[PDB]
Structures are given as C-alpha cells and as structure tokens.
Amino acid sequence: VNPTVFFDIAVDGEPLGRVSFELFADKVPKTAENFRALSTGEKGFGYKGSCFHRIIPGFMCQGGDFTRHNGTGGKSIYGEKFEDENFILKHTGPGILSMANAGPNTNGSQFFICTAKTEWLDGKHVVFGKVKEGMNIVEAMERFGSRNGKTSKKITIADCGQLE
C-alpha cells in the first residue's frame, strides 16, 4: 500500500496541527521512500525539528533542509543527492507534494507543499505526494509567509512519522 506520513506543525512553540500526506508507491518507488525515511527521522537525521524557511502565500511552503536551514543544505538517504526520479506526476493543485531542487538531478531532502495550481513546475519538479488531511494547517502556515518567502515567525516540524 501507498505510505502515509505526517508532520506536526508548530508556530514558535505554540503547536498548530497535523498535516499528513500520501506518498506514492507505483509512481515513485525511490522518491517517496526518501521522504518517508526522512519524515520518520529513520537515521539520526530527517525532517524532525527542521523548518519552513521559504513560504510564499498563494504559491507554496518550502522546507526539508535540516542541515543549514536556509536552502543549501539537506540531503537524501543516499548521501546527499539523487537523480530526477521521473516526471510522471504533475503539479495539478493545492496539497501537491513535490521535490525542490536546483535544476535536474539535484534532489536532496528539500520539498515544498503547493497551495495553488503550479503548472509551470511540471517536468522541472518531481511530484511524489499529496496532503491527505490538515490542508487547513497548511493554509494556516501561510499567514506567516511573504513575497520573498521569509517566515514571519517560525514554522517548525515539531514531529513527523509514518502511520501506514
């Protein structure tokens, strides 16, 4: 079955809620596993404690870099980077979970949660998941974003893990 993970969001201590996602199996057997093992924190590193450094209202919330906390660090479970899995799935609408990168073959640990249809991203970004529930917690992390993506407060992944 297709995995389901979650994040327990906080906003500077004060907990917000939970956002769970349905990773994809048959579509992305190597990309979903990456995000799974990290959502868990399955190796002494993963998204546990990391944050959303770049949030842009109406577009997306970005996070994943547990290393430098800016948009340079992070790393997959295969050292640091890995090829573009495939581009079979497209940025159809809000909740779409997709891999953040720096061009082709640069997938680390960084990802973004779309909060609108981001079609221009298709082909450029590997889509590998979607928010299951808590898309309300996501739409609440936006009141803390900006034009450039700077967090108006401090949105944290107070916890995360796999339920199925």
């Binding site: 870099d65 340079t72 953040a100 640069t106 973004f112 981001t118 450029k124």
Partner: peptide, 6 residues
Amino acid sequence: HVGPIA
C-alpha cells in the same frame, strides 16, 4: 540555492 519560483 534550491527552490521553485512563482
């Protein structure tokens, strides 16, 4: 620097 643009 990593990240999608608007």
